[PDB]
Amino acid sequence: MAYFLDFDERALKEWRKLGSTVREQLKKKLVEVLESPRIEANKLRGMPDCYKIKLRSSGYRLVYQVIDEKVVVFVISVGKAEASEVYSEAVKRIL
């Protein structure tokens, strides 16, 4: 690995709460970023240091930040987050 691997404590528990095969897919998408993590195509919208990988069929995703100083892919979020039902359900407090 060129870049080391780091995970947010919450994210550790996040991969545990999702499907076993789902986490393994994410892991293989991680081995490729650990070589070259700056995948500008997958850049986030607002955070230039963060990128999103997603599973085409599984629907799960992973968000990581590329830390050059410590040379590490720091995965911050793991699981399902989206656009669709974020608008659909929206809120549960103030309508």
Partner 1 sequence: KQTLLSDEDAELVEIVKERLRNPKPVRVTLDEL
Point out which residues bind partner 1 (CB under 8 A): 1, 4-12, 15, 23, 27, 30-31, 34, 41-47, 50, 52, 61, 63, 65, 72, 74, 76-77, 81-83, 86-87
Between 88 and 95, name the residue whose CB sits nearer to partner 1: 88
CB of 79 to partner 1, least distance (A): 9
Output b/e per residue, 35-49; b: 16+ Cβ within 10 A.
eebeeeebeeeeeee
Handedness of CA 41, 38, 43, 21 (dihedral sign): positive
CB of 95 to partner 1, least distance (A): 19
